[PDB]
Subunit: 115 residues, 4 copies
C-alpha cells in the first residue's frame, strides 16, 4: 500500500471516522485530475487508494473533507478542507502516510515517507 | 486590516521571513482567481492584503510557498505549498489571522478570528 | 521584555483568555522554584513576567493551566496542564516567546526566539 | 497494552527512533514516583510499558527525551523534553496512545483514548 491517510480528532481524542478524502494528480496540461477517493474507517485510516503500479511520479493533492466532519458533530469549523500537496516518487517509489490532526479552527498535517 | 498572515519556522524558532503568500477568491465558475499577494516581513507577517470593502463573503484560499522557503535554507521539504481554504463570513468577528507553523515534513495552521 | 507567553484556542479560533500561567526556575537541588506567574490577557498574551536582569541562564518551566480553561468552557480535556521546559541561553537572541495552541486532547507549543 | 507512545520527526518525515521515554505517577504524598520507562522502536513506537493491572487510576507524567534525540542528529533544540501529564482510568480502564510530533523548536502532542 503506497499511499495511506490517517486522521485524528483533537477535540474528542479519537480517530476521525467517515472522513471523505479525494486524491488528485496534476496532469500534463497542469490541471488536477481525479486519482482516487475513499473514507476513513473506524480507526481513522484510509488504505487501498492505489497500487505501486498506478502511483507514478507526479504532483498529488490529498483533499480531506474536514468541514463535513465537524458539521456532523455540531461544530461550524473554519476551513473548507485540509489540502496536502506534494511531489511523489520523484526519486523512485516510496510509501507515504499522510496524517492529519483536526480541530475546528486548526489542523496539522505531517507525512511519514518510507522506502 | 481584515486579513493577516503569520508564518513561523519550527526548525529555527523564528518568524519565517520572505515567504511568498498568494490569496485567491473562488469565482462563480468555481476557479480560483488571484486576489492579493505579498512576502512575509522580518516578523513573519503579511498585512495590507485587502480592505474591509473588498473582502466580501466568499471562499478564499491562502497559498504559502513553503517549498521555496525550505529550499533557500537547504532543507528538503515534503509539501509543494501549504494551502488554507475557508469561507469569509460577516456574522463572525471582523479580523482573520491565518497562522502557519512550518516544518520540512509538517505544518500546522490555525485561524484567529477577532474583533 | 525577555519572556512572553501566547496562548490560542484551536476550538474557538481565538486567543485563550484568562489562562493561568506559572513559570518556575530549576534550583540547585533540582527542584522547581516559583519564578513568575499571571493570567493571559484578552489577546491571549502574558507579558511582564521578568526582566533581563532576573532572567539569567538556567532551566525554566512554563506551566499553562489548560485543564481549568477547558472546564470553564464545559469541554472535557485530556491534560492536567501543558508544560514547556527549556534552557535559557545568553548566546542566542534576547526575546523568548513561548506559544501554545490548545485543543481538548492535544496541544502544540513552539518557541519564537528573536532580537 | 493500555499505554503506548508514538513519536514522529517532522524534519525528516519519519518515526523518531531510540527516543527515551520515562513515565511517572503521582504518589499519595504528591511527588512523582517512577512508573515505567523505555525507548521507541524503529517504528517510533513504545509498547509494553505496563499492564492493565498495574495501570491504576492516577495522575501520570510521560516525559519524552526530545533534547537527546535532536542532539544526536546535530541539532541544538529548544526544549529539554516534552512532558504529557494526564489523569488516567478515572472512569474505569482505558487504553491510551500518547503521540508526539517533534521539531527542533516546537512539538505537538495528542492523546487517542479508547475503551
Ligand atoms: O495511532 C494513533 O492512534 C495516533 C498516533 O498517530 N499520530 C499521528 C499524529 C500525531 C501528531 Br502529535 C500530529 C500529527 Br499532524 C499526527 O498525524
Ligand atoms: O508571537 C509570535 O512570534 C507568534 C506566536 O504565535 N503563535 C502562533 C502559533 C503557535 C502554534 Br504552537 C501553532 C500555530 Br499554527 C501558530 O500559528
Amino acid at each position: 500500500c503506497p499511499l495511506m491517510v490517517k486522521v485524528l480528532d483533537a477535540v474528542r481524542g479519537s480517530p476521525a471516522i467517515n472522513v471523505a478524502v479525494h486524491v488528485f494528480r496534476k496532469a500534463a496540461d497542469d490541471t488536477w485530475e481525479p486519482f482516487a477517493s475513499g473514507k476513513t474507517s473506524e480507526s481513522g485510516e484510509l488504505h487501498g487508494l492505489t497500487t505501486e503500479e498506478e502511483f507514478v511520479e507526479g504532483i498529488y493533492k490529498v483533499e480531506i473533507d474536514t468541514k463535513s466532519y465537524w458539521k456532523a458533530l455540531g461544530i461550524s469549523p473554519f476551513h473548507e478542507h485540509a489540502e496536502v500537496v506534494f511531489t511523489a516518487n520523484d526519486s523512485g517509489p516510496r510509501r507515504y502516510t499522510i496524517a492529519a490532526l483536526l480541530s475546528p479552527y486548526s489542523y496539522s498535517t505531517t507525512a511519514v515517507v518510507t522506502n
